[PDB]
A paper describes a structure:
BADHs are a group of enzymes from the aldehyde dehydrogenase (ALDH) superfamily that primarily catalyze the oxidation of betaine aldehyde (BA) to betaine; some BADHs also utilize other substrates. BADHs resemble ALDH in structure and are composed of a Rossmann-fold NAD(P)-binding domain, a catalytic (substrate-binding) domain and an oligomerization (bridging) domain. The solution data are supported by the structural analysis and emphasize the importance of the NAD+-driven structural rearrangements at the cofactor-binding and substrate-binding sites for enzymatic activity.
To maximize the structural resemblance of SaBADH to its native apo and holo states, we determined structures of the enzyme in the absence of BME. Comparison of the BME-free structures with those in the presence of BME highlight some interesting features that provide further understanding of the catalytic and inhibitory potential of SaBADH. Although this segment is unwound in apo SaBADHBME(+/−), it forms a similar helix turn in apo G234S-SaBADHBME(+/−) and apo SaBADHBME(+)PEG.
Residue numbers in the entry:
A (entry chain A), B (entry chain A): -4 to 496
C (entry chain B), D (entry chain B): 1 to 496
């Protein structure tokens, strides 16, 4: 099943890309990369050092100052970003396969990511030359005032394992479109598609040092990427505790930060929702990508009048979800990403039971022989819980949902907002007026009305509260990579003569 | 001279303003406030505790959630902000006097601040109802996509002693215009105008808890203001080390931060500049507000061909600068702000000499009997220095300039950018083309061509590098107080049927 | 009424109150009783020519055009405060001149205050753009400048309101203007010009021409020094104005009213729909731009709806706008009332039914005024002239529809495209309908609202351009692309 | 030239290549030698009527108008790539039809590629706005919709370039269009329509009408189903078009050329100014929209400047646009050349001096073509018809000025307002001048540049509206304010 993807690795680079060259780690260290479907070592790549990271940041600064890219016309930068987009489409099949091999998600999930990635690059390619800044009506006579937008500078970018190429395209596109130099480091356990995308960008051609790729989770590599004085912006997508640590580091040089740290996304279902649609979308929110996608709906809030019927209907569908190899077209859910992540998920099951919650279905590794070698976990539904519980307040980022009941509209909103997170959520009801009222009160970066999962390049994505700082995608996403400069010219300068002559 | 201002204090409140009430500190502690012209204790105000700060933040959260202000129409919020602006103008004389009394700057400097403050409020009042968000052309058929702008939420705001009411208006105006609730804490040594502005805002009328005022530098008050979980944005203007500490704290709850930490602002003078203008503006950049204003030009870069002549002409003017009471119309420069700040300035003079720099004039406290009781420091020019020196790389924020020579345009730019700062700077030359080239290469939030000092509400202000994060003033400043929410409605929802039925 | 003893009677040209160049005057009438209440100057085309040339001179001097946007904003705001300050008197004068109820005039005054305040705050918010030039070593900018000299012609229904929509952005942007209100309703406009002089503007920046003199209209639309002609009024006059503006390739902005549909589905809040159908049809005797004369109601509830509407129409209280009990005043003039009567003759000839009203009220206290009964025409169809043509009177037609699709097809079957409503508790549907209607403004479960924050204007024959909002400000600006080559090199295309 | 054996000869209406309804045709000429090179259909007003009704039907079906903006963008991009792909052939065909040098045609092709690519990227970037409503419990939005059906008339100087300026935004926004190129220069337009069919659009979304048939122009400007008429060409035709559009209150966008000043101060880079004065006057034989026929030079260097310019003008190499040595081709047609000759007769009658040129070249190889010598007219003034009127030919006038102020006053003394330049090493001054010029585009130390990223169009009689940039996109959109009352309450104004 996976052997065609295994073939691709025969030609994939194993090294870092620093300052126009594929290089090993300064100490020759390496890391084994695994396929989560069978836990087999499938590739070995360089494990970079903090000096490698250092050298990349300084190369990115040197290229920035040269102006080769930063002072290129916006139109031409747009054409190059478009050329990356065209590469993604041209190598769509291989890229989708490489992503399924590395992360375990189904091939159709990977193809959908490859479509999004193409559109992300294409969107930024188009936006690149559309806004150079503003002319201001100066309140001072005989002055000309303008705001010019410049690339922010050297940017470090840390991407997560869920999921590599898609989140990388969110950061890379705007950075290249605006003229920044970047240093990217993907998750130590999933570097395959990122290494491939760097090979393709190298084919498109960028001046030396504009793009650099650091691999691994080496000692203090993160520190250097978040704390180096030549960095102007650190953009991190991943876990909350690392995110916080990254921000503390960025403070040492008063460096701009952008964070996206996941969330406990609510899926609110009223008793006047289209029922079968809500059940369908509750499965999709809970179990696409094994519940590991950023948009996952792990917190179901359902109105008390239909709660029992919704629970039975959901549980009945969950038992039919097909687990298996992501390359097998019959598979509906692949495995979770690592031993460590599967272990955290298991332990949250113990906490659930101990707290009084009911594991209504799932909650364990599956039996079947073809899944035994893999990092599989059964899709899980947890009932009879409430907001005071750890399993409701803490995000597990696995194929697991909790179900809480609510009596009124006001209670739904209150419960949905009762979390430290604020990334995304949905409201299901045929009463659109009501759904709009709810949407307006939810503290969430994105709200879906009668849908679940949609994100796209045209609109910004990001969190309120502990889910993040800043936005990716849209004009706002482009803005994270820009800095504003006010240039004021006194066209008729006269002596002030404040001080005695 | 100062007795009319002393009269105003007879009716000024001495307390904090928390949740619609003027209150003492929870432990009844107080702090003596000084006039830097004579070091006399002129007022005693409450010294708040961390619990006071806590209570204000929670009151601000409660008011935010009630919607009284946050859900008010933008137009009406604009009218109230306009009403504050009108108060400032109506009480312009008293406010200017109170500011000269507290900070020591000349009365004309204070009147100019009062004009700026009126225009800041008036600008935000006008901008308040001009942008509600965007409609997006959704890439998904039968979806409606919109971005709605909401107030960011609870905001804490820490203002500096240089200078109180002006920097406070930069933060307050956009916060009220967008519908946020705020908690402000001015510098412990200059709370007078801030207390007055709160009395005036109370007259305009805001729902209980929308605005709160905390006084002092109490134990952990800053920590609570920067680290409390109910805060959505911390905005701090002040010293670099406190700024960094504030950001590290804000990270504990992944809270948005906005910082403005001063700079080492360059004033580049070419040999084809209008000479007398450049000398005049070099004095203004170096010595307005005793060199303590955010826009101060402490780093003069002058072309080698006119360096000796520029130095003599500058030194000759510096000896004529009139020091004195800020209420005496003859005064051209008042005192520095505190014993501590004057001490730091003295010690930088020792470091200058030890490093080999020449104190060409000034560098000490003045003799005169009418200045003896005050915190006066002579306007100072430091020659024969270079970029490698601490006195050139570190900002003193006093009435002191350094003079370095440069041979070429390329050297001017290089030297000007050779600092950890990036707030503001100027270029003087009759060759406008050249001045534009230089302006485009300087890493600075604001660049003046043939001028020095101008900031205004219509344009954003803030720093590159260690001078800050974010912007104040302009549409950008308003944006710091807003959060974006993507609402996506599927107008024709259909079952996805990904999972087996 | 005492107000009139202090009000000027002259034109305002180049900083001076002046009579007509031939001393001609015109009598102004109170439609409530047809009494002459004031006499004002009736300008000549030479007066109009003189104001245009003055506006142009002031514009060129730069005193207003080169003033800082912030300061222009502060003066527009001072005008707004003067409106609020003189709110009562202004309301009374509008009611005297136009006949609408005192309450209608108060609401106008509140709107006018907000219109001026909106543009005052917008004045200094956009100077243009910096462009990222595709040519290396070039700087590219777009500067927004005031469009220049602007002529403004306002209608009689909301004289002061429509005036503020034009005056506010013109002043905010730095243009010089020449305004001419409806010849039958100049009072509040004269008064607002007094208020403006109190604020103080450079000579020629604002000018007021009065009347309907011979070729005054033509000079305002066809003079070569005009950069923009802004007209709100009748479609025939509008077309003529645009043809004239064409002689100098002059920018035009037109608002020509419309045949505005009121769509009522059977799942609408029934009582609400009846209430809003009345409001749509009869606020200001149906002479307001946002009036909903074309009612479309779903067949399932058509009979119930017609009966309820008609029963309510019979209770509408006609009377003096100054009396607290009046719910609808008289129509504006003899000619307009005659037009409304002609339109009733067309309805009859086409075979429609006058379910109620259709004539002048009989009552004694109403005898002397220009009153017309609120009227409902039933049993008509889209092919009839009374459905296709707008009368701008206290009259509504009622047609039925079977489906959503049929309601859209009928509502879009007219030459107009200004505004309309959809009433339905199914918000999903109301939105589908609103996205398909060719109207500048669509209301979902409401009727009439307009405000400074959002643009207003028509698709199709209801206009060209927009007023209010940022788009409204933009009619008064022009873009200039200044491109600077920072490293100019010889091209050497032609042999040396 | 071989290219022509494969090129269509018909119109393109409602997804089909069709002849004229009366089978009439017209002969197309190569201005280099006046040979008939192709024969195409000559449409009737009925054909035009049919395309409009087809564009309207397709627009209403929603196949293109309701397609996602992102997908519309991708198809506009595929058109752009087809331009680059067929760059050589297209350049050769433009040169064949218009006579300009192969190098001029290549630059056009590069520009056209960038125009399409710009709008392709702009398509999905702005859907409208959310408004913060001043009314509580209301949601207010402004949705931007395609304007509808658009008629587009392009000129003969840059047929394909001017076509791309109109086609690109129309397609990007979702409009349906009907285009009619200049009757004497249809070749590249026909070819671009073939390219578009290869990309594939819904039937009726694009339509091509050919010729100058009787009342074809009038139907394109006056038909009631048109929402926007976009015309680039002569000022008289433009005015007539606007008067016609007025009959249905139709939006107009006009670009009518101009009398573009080239201002040369005595502190300009002298050699640069001479070089750019030549370029401004004689690129495309001075028939391009951005041509600088009116030279204003400071008196201090006027004599030196005139002599240098004239000496260079004598060396300009006229010839076949396909030969690498040619620097200027022939003028477009017999009529236009005759107009240029008439204008030389006016210069003489007014007493001006033909310093050089002013007639047809005498040489053998040029005998058969529509050649006109590059010409310089000296000793003229602003009061003369030759200074005030534009000929769009290879001719420039030279006038002197004493001061900055006098240069501004002279440059603005014309009925036009399209583009101009200022040359001076004193950038401060050049900027003062540029801010005072009433021109849509001002170049500082350059001449000619225009690009997709910035708007282009005229003040005064040079146009209404703008093309290129965001403002260009906006002519093809219309705003709709949808206001939703989320808590509707009865008003109860009328007694229950
Ligand atoms: Na892996
Ligand atoms: Na946050
Ligand atoms: Na003090
Ligand atoms: Na920074
Ligand atoms: Na009516
Ligand atoms: Na129209
Ligand atoms: Na010409
Ligand atoms: Na015009």
């Amino acid at each position: 099943f996976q052997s065609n993807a295994m073939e691709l690795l025969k030609h994939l680079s194993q090294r870092q890309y620093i300052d126009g060259e594929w290089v090993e780690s300064a100490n020759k260290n390496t890391r084994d990369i695994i396929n989560p479907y069978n836990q087999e070592v499938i590739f070995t790549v360089s494990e970079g050092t903090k000096e490698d990271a250092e050298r990349a940041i300084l190369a990115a600064r040197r290229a920035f100052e040269s102006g080769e890219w930063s002072q290129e016309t916006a139109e031409t930068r747009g054409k190059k970003v478009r050329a990356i987009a065209d590469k993604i489409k041209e190598h769509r099949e291989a890229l989708a396969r490489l992503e399924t091999l590395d992360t375990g998600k189904t091939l159709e999930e990977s193809y959908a990511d490859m479509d999004d990635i193409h559109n992300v690059f294409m969107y930024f390619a188009g936006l690149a030359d559309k806004d150079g800044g503003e002319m201001i009506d100066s309140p001072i006579p005989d002055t000309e005032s303008k705001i010019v937008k410049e690339p922010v500078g050297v940017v470090t970018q840390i991407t997560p394992w869920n999921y590599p190429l898609l989140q990388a395209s969110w950061k890379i596109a705007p950075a290249l479109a605006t003229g920044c130099s970047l240093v990217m480091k993907p998750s130590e356990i999933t570097p395959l598609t990122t290494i491939r995308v760097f090979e393709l960008m190298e084919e498109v051609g960028f001046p030396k040092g504009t793009i650099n790729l650091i691999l691994g989770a080496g000692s203090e590599v993160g520190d250097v990427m978040s704390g180096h004085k030549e960095v102007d912006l650190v953009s991190f997508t991943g876990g909350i505790e690392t995110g916080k640590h990254i921000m503390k580091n960025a403070a040492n040089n008063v460096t701009n930060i952008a964070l996206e740290l996941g969330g406990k996304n609510p899926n609110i279902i009223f008793d006047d929702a289209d029922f079968e649609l809500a059940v369908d979308q509750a499965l999709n929110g809970g179990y696409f990508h094994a519940g590991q996608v950023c948009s996952a709906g792990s917190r179901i809030l359902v109105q008390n009048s239909i709660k029992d019927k919704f629970e039975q209907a959901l549980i009945d569908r969950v038992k039919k979800i097909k687990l298996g190899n992501g390359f097998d077209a019959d598979t509906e859910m692949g495995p979770v990403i690592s031993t460590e992540h599967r272990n955290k998920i298991e332990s949250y099951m113990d906490v659930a039971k101990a707290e009084g919650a009911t594991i209504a279905v799932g909650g364990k590794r599956p039996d079947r022989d073809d899944l035994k070698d893999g990092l599989f976990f059964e899709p899980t539904v947890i009932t009879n819980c409430d907001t005071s519980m750890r399993i409701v307040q803490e995000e597990v980022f696995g194929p697991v949902v909790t179900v809480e009941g609510f009596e009124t509209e006001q209670e739904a909103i209150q419960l949905a907002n009762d979390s430290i997170y604020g990334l995304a959520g949905a409201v299901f009801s045929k009463d659109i007026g009501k759904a709009q009222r709810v949407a307006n009160k939810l503290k969430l970066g994105t709200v879906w009305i009668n849908d679940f999962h949609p994100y796209f390049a045209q609109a910004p994505w990001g969190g309120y509260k502990q889910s993040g700082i800043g936005r990716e995608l849209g004009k706002e996403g482009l803005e994270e990579y820009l800095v504003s400069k006010h240039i004021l010219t006194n066209t008729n300068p006269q002596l002030v003569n404040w001080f005695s002559k």
